[PDB]
Symmetry: C4
Subunit: 333 residues, 4 copies
């Protein structure tokens, strides 16, 4: 594989169509899904030349750990849909690559099993029924050694995914929510989480500048600027289009991550140049999982690592910090 | 049906081609028809997160009545072209959905019969021959219980609809103007209407900011910012592109509606975020009518209601007022 | 015929391919040819409503004559290429429509014969060899009753027309320059013309704002803002994109015409809304000529007249002056 | 041949596919390769009229020599890939056309042989292993009569060229680096070069404004604003999009060249209008070489010379200096 796009083709060959559609699709007319890619394609980087590149490093420190790349695996529910080893295959590959893995509330293997893989994992929270049960999930994750709580805040309910409706898609009986034997989150819920853990709380799905500022005020340690990969509000602005404004508004008060459409090391470089601390990558990780299980995900991460290093150095950046200081220009495509 | 586009395909199957073209077409090169869609596709919403959604309501108060959605059925002449029950099928479905229905001057069932369906209907006026006859139509509508007069002001004469000319289209002898056994409107005509009724007068087809301001000065209770679905001046700006400027200029002095290209609840949300009080929907209502008569229109309204609620809540809006306070960003497509 | 595009198809059927290409083509990669159309398609008009339209008139006064439309036939050399009656067929149709016809220096019928048709014609000048011979052409045109001298100033030499080169195109021996049995123009040449005639001198092919101002300073009675239909510099800006700036800079000091890509009455309305006094139309006139000779051109002019009236009134303009006061908005297509 | 595009088709016919791909391709998704063309296509020139064109000249003085056109042949490694005479065929044609030829560090014929052709050549440097060996290449080039050192500064290492990876491309054993029997450059390397030669040092691959200013401060005699033909960082801004800003920032302190996508004399004119001293042309020279060897390159240069003269005069420019004073307008395509 020489690009992330090689893996999509390979996943399409192997997966049943309805599963590939669950993975690929967006809500509504898929306008936000397409705009995630359009928005990245319009961004051009202004590289710097003639800088010392004797020890180019792609590492970052985030949420108290060193990561090998400015990248984490995004929360994607029900990974046994894509391969029988599901979340364990992905978490092992992430660990070995030095990349954070986000364990999902709707994981198809229990959070404790995935955390046992090692690799200092993060945990993604959906707000439950009950303040008490939500807080018990958080405490489970913390007791298992998760290092951050990624509170997904863009899902008061699930978006209308027309491919899934047309397909009549539903979970095979062999895939379950392994953390179990939901209610809309508010700012009060965020406070309840923050008060119940010493881990950093990261709010995922922020797009409005004032919501970014309020996240800082609320004691978040990070946010993920995101339209949920075009799967929630159809017509929501891409996160990459809000990122620069959000980074300026928080003015270093929390880590600012982005996701949606990241498909190469060049894309990671664009996100960092716009001010991102790191990115999340969703669909490509699942394509690699579907195509070749753990070794697929390892090869994907390897490929991304090489593309990130290549892009950084071509742009004159010996560190991710330097990449954040790059300027950009909007083009037409 | 899971999108409004399912119904277009179904209407194309059933209708004779020349009738489908009368419905679908625009004037000239159809540049304004296409731009109505392009303009909406370029608008992205910036959703808000973590707000209380315990009683999300899509209701609005407009022209003295509660409506179930920020939406009304647009005036479309000669609805028996599309189904034998024509206007009665549509008005019944609108009533049952709690959506205003606009009865047309060129309705193929008499205004009194349609008003008898109930549902507190509006009446669309074309200026006649004669100040006296125009005012008699208005008085008929008012006597029948219509609640607003939608004065169409963008038709000094009909636009050049090339599909209809190429087809040699004409009304089947079984479709007539049931209100009967036209001259260009001016501001004087508006005053004559305003002086002759206590109902709100809504001027439909306003695009210039100064015409919006003058509409307020003239005592209009509303305007519909509109290029007549691309059927009048070919090259007229889409209403959605003028809406924000117009809303700022009237500064609450009348209700500001918009139409042209509204094809989903997401589109309704975009219109409200740009400052619209409500939208009109034209062609999609007729597709549903053609496809399945009254029950078709009911299903369409049901679908739109669900899409509006879904979009609002995903955007953090518990009310239409809150949706009006959303910000937007123009993208490229 | 219900659009100008019907006539192009009809001309393509009848003309030999190499002649159709001489007519259709542009220079270089035809980037300026395409941009003439793109530029018009991006312009949207903001129509006005509810104005008195009791005597809508499309007439203008220009260069001391009433014209029936804000339009003239552009100078197109060698019109016998397209029909055996050539320039006489076109000039007769123009006369009967009340539209100015521009007689070309490279006309395939002598200027005196064409002027004898009547209709108060204009004369287009190319600068010759010789100040003396150039001035003799001007005096011929004036003696024959031409009413303006359209000095083409964008042809120091002919552009590189790759269709013609690829075709090995050349004039059939039956088509000649009937005014005869060239050197680049300068501002000195303009002065020599201005000093030798009392007719208005109109400089055709101006695109720079400072050249428009200098044209006024030089005593021009008009300019034609033009990239020569994309046939001269490939990559020259479309005239329609310079028009508004030029109109503001001359501030009523001369008539400001535009050409390139005008294909409907809606396009004429856009040009006037951007500040044009009138337009020239080139290729469409030749399509009508090729398709049906004099009666073809009559039908074209009839069609354009109806489209101009239709567009004006739909836009709330009772006169061309009012159309010049319309505002516009740039869109995306 | 009547356009540069005729030669691409001819090169595609003759070259083995993997060689054509080595020539045509870019890095990554080829976004920067495509953007080089898009960026030029968006630029329109505002031509001037009625200026004296009695002795239009396309000549410039650069780096102490007269050149016949504001153009040089770009450094392209391994030209024996394309024709058996390789660099000698191209250098001879360049000499005869009065165009500078850039001899490459990775030339497939030795720099001394190519310099012996005559035509006052330039030499392109890649930084070696060793300050000492790099400086020996420079001294060789100077001893052989090269007139400028084009220090390529955008290649700390080679970009990821996916066509080449997919093809498993490698140099045929009959093509070698004839200057031999690499380490990343820094500003210190530039200083080492500047101190070791009296020739002008030209830094090729600058895109950031501050790097342009620093190049002047460092004693460069020129820069080439360039993204390396889309072959280095994928997502690097096109040079043509940075050019105007860079020209203003250096304010005459060094020559400012540009490359990437120049495919006609019209494109050369656009580059000059944006402030370029001259352009480099890469791929088209190799297409002509592949198609017809030395005589191919001669015909290409002949064609470009005619297109440059044609464009200049159509734009009212008697000299390249005048072309630099032309204004431009960005369009949509
Ligand atoms: C491709 C995909 C993405 C999700 C799920 C399932 C699938 C198949 N997720 C879910 O299906 C899920 C989402 C909401 C409610 C219930 C299940 C999921 C989720 N987010 C999140 O915080 N919890 C979930 O568990 N997402 C979004 C994901 O984290 C991410 O924002 C993006 O994928 C980014 O863009 P990409 O790199 O272009 O793919
Ligand atoms: C699709 C359609 C739209 C009309 C008619 C017929 C048809 C088949 N109408 C007419 O045909 C009509 C219009 C002018 C003169 C005589 C008949 C009509 C009209 N308006 C209005 O105020 N009285 C009429 O009665 N319109 C415009 C309509 O109210 C509306 O502005 C839009 O349809 C909005 O865009 P959409 O949601 O994209 O379709
Ligand atoms: C389509 C066409 C246009 C010309 C000629 C021949 C043909 C076949 N003309 C010539 O062929 C001609 C031009 C330069 C030198 C010798 C012959 C011509 C000319 N101009 C002008 O002032 N004298 C000439 O005589 N033009 C340009 C014309 O006046 C006009 O600017 C446009 O056609 C406008 O755009 P359109 O409406 O999109 O077609
Ligand atoms: C088309 C092409 C372009 C290069 C090479 C090989 C080929 C086949 N060059 C190389 O292959 C090369 C580049 C880096 C490392 C080793 C070999 C090359 C180079 N630059 C440079 O300074 N030394 C090298 O020697 N370039 C870039 C070239 O100078 C130029 O910037 C552009 O080609 C401009 O755009 P274009 O007119 O659209 O083609
Ligand atoms: O009710 C839903 O839409 C749903 O399944 C869900 C899942 C996760 C979070 C919130 C809602
Ligand atoms: O005369 C017309 O164009 C016409 O039919 C009409 C219809 C309604 C309103 C105004 C004019
Ligand atoms: O020499 C030319 O290019 C030519 O034919 C011409 C024609 C008219 C005007 C100027 C030049
Ligand atoms: O190591 C490389 O990528 C390489 O081949 C190279 C070639 C020229 C300059 C610098 C690096
Ligand atoms: Mg992503
Ligand atoms: Mg609508
Ligand atoms: Mg024209
Ligand atoms: Mg180039």
């Amino acid at each position: 594989y020489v690009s992330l796009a090689d893996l999509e083709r390979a996943a399409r060959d192997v997966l049943p169509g309805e599963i590939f559609d669950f993975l690929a699709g967006g809500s509504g007319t898929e306008a936000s899904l397409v705009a995630n890619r359009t928005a990245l394609e319009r961004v051009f980087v202004i590289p710097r030349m003639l800088r010392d590149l004797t020890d180019v490093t792609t590492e970052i420190d985030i949420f108290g750990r060193r990561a090998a790349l400015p990248m984490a695996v995004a929360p994607v529910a029900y990974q046994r849909l894509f391969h029988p080893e599901g979340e364990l295959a992905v978490a092992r590959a992430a660990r070995d690559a030095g990349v954070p893995y986000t364990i999902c509330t709707l994981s198809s293997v229990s959070l404790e099993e995935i955390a046992a893989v090692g690799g200092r994992p993060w945990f993604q929270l959906f707000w439950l029924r009950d303040e008490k049960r939500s807080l018990d999930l958080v405490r489970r994750a913390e007791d298992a050694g998760c290092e951050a709580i990624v509170f997904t805040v863009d899902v008061p309910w699930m978006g209308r995914r027309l491919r899934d409706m047309r397909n009549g898609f539903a979970l095979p009986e062999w895939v379950t929510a392994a953390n179990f034997d939901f209610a809309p989150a508010t700012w009060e819920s965020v406070e309840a989480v923050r008060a119940h853990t010493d881990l950093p709380v990261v709010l995922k799905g922020i797009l409005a500048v004032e919501d970014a500022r309020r996240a800082v005020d609320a004691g978040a340690g990070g946010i993920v600027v995101s339209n949920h990969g075009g799967r929630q509000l159809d017509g929501a602005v891409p996160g990459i289009e809000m990122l620069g404004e959000i980074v300026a508004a928080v003015s270093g008060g929390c880590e600012v991550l982005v996701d949606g459409g990241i498909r190469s090391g060049g894309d990671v470089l664009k996100a960092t140049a716009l001010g991102a601390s790191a990115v999340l990558v969703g669909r490509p990780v699942m394509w690699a999982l579907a195509a070749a299980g753990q070794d697929g995900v390892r090869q994907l991460l390897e490929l991304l690592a090489e593309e990130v290093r290549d892009a950084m150095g071509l742009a004159g950046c010996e560190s991710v910090g330097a990449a954040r200081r790059l300027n950009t220009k909007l083009g037409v495509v």
